[PDB]
Design a protein around this ligand. Structure first.
Ligand SMILES: Cc1ncc(C[n+]2csc(CCOP(=O)(O)OP(=O)(O)O)c2C)c(N)n1
Ligand SMILES: Cc1ncc(C[n+]2csc(CCOP(=O)(O)OP(=O)(O)O)c2C)c(N)n1
Ligand SMILES: Cc1ncc(C[n+]2csc(CCOP(=O)(O)OP(=O)(O)O)c2C)c(N)n1
Ligand SMILES: [Ca+2]
Ligand SMILES: [Ca+2]
Ligand SMILES: [Ca+2]
Ligand SMILES: [Mg+2]
Lengths: 524, 525, 524
């Protein structure tokens, strides 16, 4: 058997049947004789390729396979990999390398010191020392990406390797099962449950790894058992809790003082599946107010190590959430009261307020809709106004790297064809991966794109105000016609200059058969 | 003085007055109080920001300054940095980092292992140990970028550093002059000259570093004195020789066997300013045929070390080219036999052949026009059919990384407002950096973009053909409206479905005052 | 408080009270005002510092703290870090950096690209961006080194940081508890238990991580339950099992074909706490013969991902071994019969056979002795002839990096003052970290060093034979007088040119009160 055949059988047996790519000469030998049982998803830009695979991996909760072209292709994908690292996305990234005979002279398309290129944004980077080693390296890549903490991995393969003969003993690779679904030992776990039962005013904080492990339901039960208010960790890449649940308290502000102030009065704080903490703005103060004890459960050793306070437990979030939810006593305390419904903002017949857009989406979108957010100046309003009952309903670039939501929305839609994906993207962020639109049109992926157009870098303007910075250039982005951009890539475009038009467009988009883009004129 | 004021004074004193950027919160403290003598050029994407800066640096023959945001921004620009490494572009890439007080907890926007991120694609990568060191670090970066072999450098700066006090002794950095324009010592230089003089059949091979050093004229004199045929190194990122000069033989095919054959018979082969060699396709054979002696002159130690044959000299192209040009004696040998004329290919009144397009461009474009090529399948024909007699008249992505030409065509146009830039770009390549068009509109850079739309990844379909590779997915890119994309970013758009329309389109484009995009319906392979 | 005080308090609160080091100017501001509750162990060389700390960490099953000088000091120690990586030794390596004001100009003693230097032989490499962060960085290092899979970490600190003001919120670091004591979920653990109970002919293979977790007893129980033969994985760094137990089958030869042959007939092979596998010699063949299924329990994701065959479970060895040992049913199968005692080799009145030396050590050493092996050409003989009943009784360079055993023997002896340490080192290996002897004499660490002198690189001479390689230079090391070297460093020395002198020297050595070195004349 050839390395080519052996490799595809490996992918197939490990449950991988989709290839997200942008091709090059180095990758032709691998793409040739493409298995009929495999699917290839072309994106025009590498940043788009990874974004789409990222959305697909996250929604499907399974590793995604990518094929890029040498250093140039890998390089273009770097920004996307930065997000994938933060969101623990299981991405197997392969890139074609020059033929071994030509690597020495550094011929054109040679990926120099290839393993080093994507570092430090991957848990594993590797180039095999021989063709026969390739299947085994691929097997390594598959399990490294899938083991906790999940993350992107990198593999470089010289194009001449694929036709070579593969080692017959590679058959042992096909059916390897690697598990990391583990939880705290019985003894220590009982001590933890003791502590939770004995707390007089517990609070719970959930991060994206809860949604990734589909432990949302288990967390809901745990909260109901402890009668505890629930928060989502700051800078949230996902949503791990029904946002209308009486326990839900909303998105924590990404500041040190702000968070210790919020947790004040809570004697024990259970953090599940989140870093402690993913702060953003400079907000000096106490990490925790005296009287508050923090206990962290995380799947990532790097997160437990760098937390500046509290105890940490490194385990699988799914197994841990399940264990706790089923072991804690039912507290007699009153169940928390659901937060009040957001106030209706005053809306004239002009440009729409971000609050109005969200309220309208909430009224018109299906109950099982999936939202992506890359509208940076309106994130807070988005969490308050969208009712998200189900898991996997929200995605936001995990490292703050723009260009994520647009291609990811296509990947997510591909992963969940029964759920309407609605991406809310700012006029600024939209340009980073605009060409992903073409993939949506080409593969009939009925994703809905809502472009929030206020002609500027909203968030940046705000920051410039709180720093008091004057004469800052490059904050404005006038002169972009997004309907023409969407026509450029074969996507139906609509405009919403006002509320009347916004409802009309939303109704039309929801009904349309293919992907639709709506340009909304929002206030500055 | 603040680190902010000191750093801007250093850039000012070092001849930098332009900043290509895409801003983020980590960079606000730096962009604030933007000096009135500085000019900021905004790009919607990072790849686009770097590409434009690259074109600007290569055409101006001076280092370019870039400001990006954290790892996300730097990452988006990696593909572009691969090209820049290969073309020795002097680029100074600075990226904002999180406040020092917030790095430890790895807050959002922290650039982890910052200096490691752009490796191995930069000459130098660094994050200062404190605020006061920032100005010094910036100096190191400026000089690392400008010193032979020129290249991109990376500097990460925590945003809280800008408002801090600078070391008073930082003033010593302002007027620092560093020179690397050196040449072979007199003794060894005379020996080399003697070799060239005694050669009975020398050949010359020029690389992109010749055009970078503006050594084209000196190389012409040298070629004329030696009466030697002149070739351009394979995968040529630039043009270092008048393509219509009688010594010019053309672009070398990127194959080991193809090159040894072309050089057969030449007792002495002098290679100037090129890697040896930048092969591409697998084309196994002899590196050099017996009886052929090769001498390479490079400014990059890495190039001299990796060459699989010949002697090498690591020196400044400018100085070396000038020295040799004026040292070699005039040979009485006869000039090289005149090269045949590119045939006028068959063309009906339907979709245009790439050759028809190049012939028309060469007939209508000004003598001092600058071309940028990102049409991968038509490169060979472009070189045969375009008369480029001046320096700085050609750019092609140096590492083969697509997404170069479009933004770079804007950078080049900015650097040379008196020369008409004409980007020839395949429908595939055009998508990698499409948003760059917005920058041309916003700042009214009158670059002309010619999109060769054949609906496919031409070069790939061909390579798949020779490999007898059947059932290869992802080679077709149908359903792309480029006039609509141009409109989306505010650029005037025209279309050419046939020869007559192409001519009229070019005429209109050359008389336009702003950027113009022309979608050309070319024949699919 | 100062960064200096805060830091010593953190180490104190985290259980650290010993600094192994070799000082430099960059380390003076750290070492000044050395806390009275801390002890400092000086070594003449860096490879020796880390070797000693490594031995101490392995034997105490706790993280060892190290202090080295800048780049030159760190550099000198990288061979030893190579062993520590393979042994999963929890070493916290700290190295002084130039003052922040001088790093830019690259003054003398400046550690350029400090974080990159130790890579990739460390779990985590870091240099704080400010002095106030030093304490937090130290916290990360401590936890990163202690979390499974344990291993070495590296922190570079500019010497001017120590005298700076610490962040008051640093107090949150002091009592952080981080646990990775985890095991497979009940559901999946039940399936594994069933597979083991239904096994018709199971075998067990143990690695060094068993002895590290002190799960030896649990493994014994598991073995007796299942009535299964017990191997030790190849290239063994430690001894995870009593070598005279009825189930004990010995150390597996370090080859592919040899191991699959040995496992032939066993339907289920359970590998615990070992890579799969640490092969050495070139022995091509089947990874496993048909009919043999393999299950591996490892605490290291890198090991699980790279095994060429079998299923894997990534969990804590201590927790998993305990659960399994108490869950599996008692088999009705007949308990294996103990391996027959090794034959007595013929010994004339001249030089000594390695076999004779081990037989004599076994006869005269205490039952709780601790052996360290650096006699590369006599490892097999050593495993068969030494009866090691207890945990922590054997150590061997885990990456085959020589210069480990001499200093490590000192570290182990320091960690275990009640157990006699006996290091068996070849004349060749003795030279790599010879100056370590000084430390044993300085602090009167009564380690016994047995030098096997055959005046050559035995193992190398043997390998040159298999490859029929002739005319190989540098294989002989004549003219080394080890008694004079011991005298040079203040250690009592004895000689043994024959069996009668071996017995004599051994009795005196064991009766000795300080360290002793015995030079034994062994056959070629
Ligand atoms: C790749 C990348 N480039 C730049 C930034 C910095 N950045 C963050 S938000 C933002 C403005 C986003 O504009 P828009 O999409 O309009 O959101 P708005 O603030 O207008 O709601 C920028 C430039 C980033 N986070 N990632
Ligand atoms: C960033 C990047 N991605 C992928 C490739 C591989 N690649 C080389 S040529 C090519 C197709 C280019 O098509 P087009 O621009 O239409 O030129 P044509 O071949 O059609 O003439 C691709 C995908 C590359 N060189 N750079
Ligand atoms: C630092 C280091 N250098 C070299 C080697 C290679 N090596 C392994 S064993 C050996 C010879 C050891 O000889 P000795 O300690 O006398 O034992 P003998 O083979 O004589 O029994 C060498 C050179 C190594 N493993 N580590
Ligand atoms: Ca905006
Ligand atoms: Ca094309
Ligand atoms: Ca020896
Ligand atoms: Mg890198």
């Amino acid at each position: 058997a050839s390395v080519h055949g052996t490799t595809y059988e490996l992918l197939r047996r490990q449950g991988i049947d989709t290839v997200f790519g942008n091709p090059g000469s180095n990758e032709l030998p691998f793409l040739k004789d493409f298995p009929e049982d495999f699917r290839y998803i072309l994106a025009l830009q590498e940043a788009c390729v990874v974004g789409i695979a990222d959305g697909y991996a996250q929604a499907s909760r399974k590793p995604a396979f990518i094929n890029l072209h040498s250093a140039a292709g890998t390089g273009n994908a770097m920004g996307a990999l930065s997000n994938a690292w933060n969101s623990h996305s299981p991405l197997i990234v392969t890139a074609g390398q020059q033929t071994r005979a030509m690597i020495g002279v550094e011929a054109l398309l040679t990926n120099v010191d290839a393993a080093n290129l994507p570092r430090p944004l991957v848990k594993w980077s590797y180039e095999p020392a021989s063709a026969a080693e390739v299947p085994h390296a691929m097997s390594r890549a598959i399990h490294m990406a899938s083991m906790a903490p999940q993350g992107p991995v990198y593999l470089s393969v010289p194009y001449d390797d694929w036709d070579k003969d593969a080692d017959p003993q590679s058959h042992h690779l096909f059916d390897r099962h690697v598990s990391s679904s583990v939880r705290l030992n019985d003894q220590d776990l009982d001590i933890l449950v003791k502590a939770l039962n004995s707390a007089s005013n517990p609070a719970i904080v959930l991060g994206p790894d809860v949604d990734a492990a589909n432990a949302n339901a288990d967390c809901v039960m745990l909260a109901e058992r402890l009668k505890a208010p629930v928060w989502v960790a700051p800078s949230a890449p996902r949503c791990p809790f029904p946002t209308r649940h009486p326990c839900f308290r909303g998105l924590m502000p990404a500041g040190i003082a702000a968070i210790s102030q919020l947790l004040e009065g809570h004697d024990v704080v259970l953090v599940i599946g989140a870093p402690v903490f993913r702060y953003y703005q400079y907000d000096p103060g106490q990490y925790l107010k005296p009287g508050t004890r923090l206990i962290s459960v995380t799947c990532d050793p790097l997160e437990a190590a760098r937390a500046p306070m509290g105890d940490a437990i490194v385990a699988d979030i799914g197994a841990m959430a399940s264990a706790l939810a089923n072991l804690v006593e039912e507290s007699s305390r009153q169940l928390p009261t659901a937060a009040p419904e957001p106030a209706k903002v005053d809306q004239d017949a002009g440009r729409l307020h971000p609050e109005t857009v969200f309220d309208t989406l909430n009224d018109m979108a299906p109950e099982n809709a999936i939202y992506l957010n890359e509208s940076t100046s309106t994130t807070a309003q988005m969490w308050q106004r969208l009712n998200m009952r189900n898991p996997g309903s929200y995605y936001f670039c995990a490292a703050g790297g723009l260009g994520f939501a647009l291609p990811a929305a296509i990947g997510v839609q591909l992963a969940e064809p029964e759920r309407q994906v609605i991406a809310v993207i700012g006029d600024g962020s939209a340009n980073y991966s605009i060409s992903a639109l073409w993939t949506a049109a080409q593969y009939n992926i009925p994703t809905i794109f809502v472009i929030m157009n206020n002609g500027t870098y909203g968030i940046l303007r705000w920051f410039a105000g709180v720093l008091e910075a004057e004469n800052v250039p490059g904050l404005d982005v006038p002169g972009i016609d997004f309907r023409a951009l969407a026509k450029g890539y074969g996507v139906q475009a609509l405009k919403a200059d006002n509320l009347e038009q916004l409802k009309g467009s939303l109704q039309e988009a929801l009904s349309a058969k293919g992907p639709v883009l709506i340009e909304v004129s929002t206030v500055s």
